[PDB]
Symmetry: D2
Subunit: 26 residues, 4 copies
């Protein structure tokens, strides 16, 4: 469970960065 939660956390951190990039580009 801890490893799966860590990876979801990782994904969401990355999603924040990606979405901020997309906001700039739009």
């Amino acid at each position: 469970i801890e490893e799966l939660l860590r990876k979801i956390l990782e994904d969401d951190a990355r999603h924040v960065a990606e979405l901020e990039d997309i906001e700039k580009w739009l």
Copy 2:
């Protein structure tokens, strides 16, 4: 941008799946 959004949404679909399993294990 469209491709990147697609990847992000595929991640969230996977997150639903993983969170649902984590609920079961907990």
Copy 3:
């Protein structure tokens, strides 16, 4: 913990729907 996980799951399901909408609109 279960209630917090349920709400994250909810959010991600909604995010899938929202991102599919944004893909259509783009």
Copy 4:
């Protein structure tokens, strides 16, 4: 679209925060 993306990214920032606390409680 830009406003909706902003809301989605704010959610993911909150998800990081919630997942981090869940890791601590677990």
